Amino acid sequence: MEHVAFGSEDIENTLAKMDDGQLDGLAFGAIQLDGDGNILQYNAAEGDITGRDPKQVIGKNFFKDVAPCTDSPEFYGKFKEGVASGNLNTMFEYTFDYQMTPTKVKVHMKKALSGDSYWVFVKRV
Numbered sequence: 192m193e194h195v196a197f198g199s200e201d202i203e204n205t206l207a208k209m210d211d212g213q214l215d216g217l218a219f220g221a222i223q224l225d226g227d228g229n230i231l232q233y234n235a236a237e238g239d240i241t242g243r244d245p246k247q248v249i250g251k252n253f254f255k256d257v258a259p260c261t262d263s264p265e266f267y268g269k270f271k272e273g274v275a276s277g278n279l280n281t282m283f284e285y286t287f288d289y290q291m292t293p294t295k296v297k298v299h300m301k302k303a304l305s306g307d308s309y310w311v312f313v314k315r316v
């Protein structure tokens with residue numbers, strides 16, 4: 192298992208070296224979105240939590256297609272604000288409830304070290 196803790200201050204540096212394969216070894220869910228919310232990476236843990244088959248959600252829009260619950264000021268709103276500002280690092284609890292048993296989670300969104308990419312980390316609470 193890849194030893195990286197949820198909420199780590201330099202997490203973006205650590206994950207910049209990981210391929211989709213290594214991303215599946217994280218102890219928490221990890222999604223990489225582009226500026227428009229399109230899914231570039233989606234690890235196994237995220238699949239476990241949401242029920243989605245990883246390889247099938249890549250290329251889909253997270254806020255429009257995959258996770259409509261999220262599409263709100265408290266989630267998507269924070270995301271679009273961070274994208275426009277070029278800076279993003281926020282942590283909050285949220286309830287995942289679309290076509291799934293309502294699941295409470297802790298979400299951490301942070302701008303990737305890369306150009307136009309952003310991370311969304313999820314773990315159960």
Ligand SMILES: *C(=O)/C=C\c1ccc(O)cc1
Pocket residue numbers: 241242243257258259260261286287288289290291
């Ligand atoms: C709300 O929609 C939040 C998360 C989420 C992500 C994927 C799927 O499939 C359901 C729910």
